């Protein structure tokens, strides 16, 4: 509630030199370095006490911030987010003040940030050789869970002749990183077409996306080779047929098709008009590779099928686009104002700021700038982020003597 209210009353800016933003960056070295500040941001240097509950250095005086390495920490978006999250900091204080047993409580921003209340230095990846920080809040299971509803994917991989070499490498890495964003409530299969569509693995239908099945699909995608002429009709026919199977267990929700191709001059209007006429199935098209093939039909399949078009020119662009289809999938959730704000608890996972086994309870935050004073409402269909609060599994163990 406070996050929505305080983002509703935010004024966009492009100049922070005149009004610095003061915040504690988690990946700051403990050295009293006066020269580790960005132009638009002044960094807090905290006093860290050792706490029994957390087992790390903990500062209750302010919230810490995590900004991924691949994201610049002084751009306009990041600086505005760091400006309007101070009310989140204050409500963090209030929550911990009314319940001293709280563990990490965090706002996972959709710009890449993450602002957890007990200020603690990042785990081992602040500044350490061979310890690179690949953490991104928008890939985390709790964020993936609270950002949308359970999926029914079907990844169409285009293993034809024209994808040999670097394109196939990027496609298999991209499919692996796409599978790594599916929870246990999600059902996925992977198909592959070259003038003839087939399953890449031993699965014949949509299977649950748990660790074992995800590994099987990943092995099948890694073992895949490129050969033959493309056929976008026999592939989408296979996809739309496998999404019409109701004999198997499913999550009857969010039917999707993920097309991992490069480009071509084939739009397949009649396949879509036959199988997807009520537009019940989305189509996200990915133009993977560094090439000069036509990308018009690829961008058109996404438009006429409620999808979105992503480009993956090289490894390093892989991580961001998966988070982004999930950004797209949350539009129907936003429009359902308060029926979509329900607390959900994730599977037992190992905490990042190492605490052992935890479950996180998520709740999405909606952009409410234009509401009851209706404006153009350009991007009011996207969530601001997801709020999570951790419950220690050893904290549950103490309620069962």
């Amino acid at each position: 509630l406070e996050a929505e209210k305080v983002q509703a009353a935010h004024q966009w800016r492009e100049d922070f030199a005149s009004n610095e933003v003061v915040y504690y960056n988690a990946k700051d070295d403990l050295d009293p370095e006066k020269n580790d500040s960005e132009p638009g941001s002044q960094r807090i240097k905290p006093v860290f006490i050792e706490d029994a509950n957390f087992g790390r250095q903990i500062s209750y005086q302010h919230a810490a911030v995590h900004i991924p390495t691949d994201i610049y920490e002084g751009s306009t978006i990041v600086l505005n987010e760091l400006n309007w999250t101070s009310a989140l900091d204050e409500v963090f204080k209030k929550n911990r003040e009314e319940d001293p047993s709280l563990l990490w409580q965090v706002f996972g921003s959709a710009t890449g940030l993450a602002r957890y209340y007990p200020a603690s230095p990042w785990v081992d990846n602040s500044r350490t050789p061979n310890k690179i920080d690949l953490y991104d809040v928008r890939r985390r299971p709790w964020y993936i869970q609270g950002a949308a509803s359970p999926k029914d994917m079907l990844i169409l991989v285009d293993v034809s002749g024209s994808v040999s070499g670097l394109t196939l490498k990027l496609i298999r890495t991209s499919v692996s990183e796409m599978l790594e964003t599916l929870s246990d409530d999600d059902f996925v299969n992977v198909a592959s077409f070259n003038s003839n569509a087939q399953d890449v693995s031993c699965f014949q239908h949509l299977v649950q996306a748990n660790v074992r099945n995800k590994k099987v699909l990943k092995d099948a995608v890694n073992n895949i080779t490129a050969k033959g002429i493309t056929d976008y009709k026999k592939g989408f026919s296979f996809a739309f047929e496998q999404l019409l199977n109701y004999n198997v267990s499913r999550a009857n929700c969010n039917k999707i098709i993920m097309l991992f191709t490069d480009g071509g001059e084939e739009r397949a209007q009649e396949i879509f008009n036959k199988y997807n006429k009520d537009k019940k199935v989305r189509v996200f098209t990915f133009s993977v590779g560094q090439h000069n093939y036509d990308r018009g039909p690829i961008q058109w399949m996404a438009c006429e099928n409620k999808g979105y078009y992503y480009e993956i020119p090289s490894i390093g662009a892989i991580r961001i686009n998966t988070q982004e289809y999930l950004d797209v999938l949350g539009r129907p959730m936003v429009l359902a104002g308060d029926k979509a704000k329900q607390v959900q608890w994730t599977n037992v996972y190992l905490d990042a700021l190492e605490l052992g086994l935890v479950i996180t309870g998520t709740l999405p935050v909606f952009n409410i700038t234009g509401q009851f004073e209706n404006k153009t409402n350009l991007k009011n269909q996207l969530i601001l982020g997801v709020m999570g609060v951790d419950v220690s599994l050893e904290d549950i163990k103490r309620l069962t003597p």
Binding site: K279, A336, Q342, Q381
Partner: peptide, 19 residues
Amino acid sequence: KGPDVCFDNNVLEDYTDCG
């Protein structure tokens, strides 16, 4: 047993953002 309530296919959704 899967989740009960899920949100997809709204009619107010603006699809003109194919990126």
